[PDB]
Design a protein around this ligand. Structure first.
Ligand SMILES: CCCCCCCCCO[C@@H]1O[C@H](CO)[C@@H](O)[C@H](O)[C@H]1O
Ligand SMILES: CCCCCCCCCO[C@@H]1O[C@H](CO)[C@@H](O)[C@H](O)[C@H]1O
Ligand SMILES: CCCCCCCCCO[C@@H]1O[C@H](CO)[C@@H](O)[C@H](O)[C@H]1O
Ligand SMILES: CCCCCCCCCO[C@@H]1O[C@H](CO)[C@@H](O)[C@H](O)[C@H]1O
Ligand SMILES: CCCCCCCCCO[C@@H]1O[C@H](CO)[C@@H](O)[C@H](O)[C@H]1O
Ligand SMILES: CCCCCCCCCO[C@@H]1O[C@H](CO)[C@@H](O)[C@H](O)[C@H]1O
Ligand SMILES: CCCCCCCCCO[C@@H]1O[C@H](CO)[C@@H](O)[C@H](O)[C@H]1O
Ligand SMILES: CCCCCCCCCO[C@@H]1O[C@H](CO)[C@@H](O)[C@H](O)[C@H]1O
Length: 181
């Protein structure tokens, strides 16, 4: 098999934006894609979402897209493109919102979305085995190591932990809902 359309297009888009950032510089791209950083930009609606497409180091984009490929790919294949779209939109909005509230509008990346996917896949598997969706034991360990890395700012460039929690909460909430139904 291969990655579905949403999984694939997100990966492509992030790579393209990362290349633009190397060519033009990070700030030049943030000017266009960052969460609104001035009142004159509040109705540029793409900005509530496009922050998720920007990454600020090789490790940032590499591990984000690895988790996205694996977890997003599984969700899309087993549960449909629509499911992945909604998890992605809600988690990007809410984690972005909490991030800007605590730390300002200059941020970006899929880290909040990955937290949501981790929470979703794990909880869905823990509550509802018959879905085909779950987070294997071994990968729980490595997910935790990735979480710890960001939680303790072990690379200096991490989001607010409140933003992490916000993303995780979206994934857990959606999995809870899907496990009831
Ligand atoms: C540190 C991050 C953890 C990385 C875990 C390994 C990721 C391996 C991804 O596998 C790929 O997944 C796609 C959708 O799930 C499939 O379409 C594809 O056939 C399969 O090869
Ligand atoms: C350039 C094509 C962009 C859209 C992705 C095509 C759908 C791939 C489906 O794969 C199925 O898993
Ligand atoms: C793969 C590339 C990813 C780019 C992300 C979309 C950026 C959208 C910015 O739109 C801007 C009109 O008005 C609008 C335009 O002026
Ligand atoms: C979530 C709903 C979004 C509503 C969109 C509001 C567009 C408002 C444009 O107003 C004009 O610009 C300044 C005003 O004169
Ligand atoms: C986590 C969510 C992932 C980010 C999704 C960002 C989608 C942004 C789409 O931008 C839109 O592109 C159009 C094409 O021209 C423009 O006409 C329009 O003005 C612009 O708003
Ligand atoms: C520093 C990053 C190191 C990543 C090492 C990944 C270990 C191997 C994981 O493989 C993946 O395991 C999943 C569950 O078995 C399969 O669903 C998937 O298809 C497969 O690709
Ligand atoms: C198998 C996953 C283990 C991940 C260990 C290294 C992840 C680094 C995450 O930081 C990234 C800050 O953002 C950058
Ligand atoms: C459903 C949305 C929930 C959002 C919750 C956000 C507020 C949580 C507070 O977290 C604490 O405060 C700081 C957060 O940035 C971190 O310094 C600290 O490590 C963390 O423990």
């Amino acid at each position: 098999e291969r990655a579905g359309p949403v999984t694939w297009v997100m990966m492509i888009a992030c790579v393209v934006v990362f290349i633009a950032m190397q060519i033009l510089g990070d700030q030049e791209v943030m000017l266009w894609l960052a969460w609104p950083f001035d009142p004159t930009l509040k109705f540029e609606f793409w900005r509530y979402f496009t922050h998720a497409l920007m990454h600020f180091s090789l490790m940032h984009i590499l591990f984000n897209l690895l988790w996205w490929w694996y977890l997003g790919g599984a969700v899309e294949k087993r549960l449909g493109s629509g499911k992945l779209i909604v998890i992605t939109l809600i988690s990007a909005l809410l984690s972005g919102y909490v991030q800007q509230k605590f730390s300002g509008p200059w941020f970006g990346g899929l880290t909040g979305v990955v937290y949501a996917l981790m929470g979703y896949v794990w909880l869905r598997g823990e509550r509802d085995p018959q879905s085909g969706i779950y987070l294997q034991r071994g990968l729980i360990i490595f997910a935790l190591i990735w979480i710890v890395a960001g939680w303790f700012d072990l690379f200096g460039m991490s989001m607010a932990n409140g933003a992490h929690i916000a993303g995780l909460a979206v994934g857990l909430a959606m999995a809870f809902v899907d496990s009831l139904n």
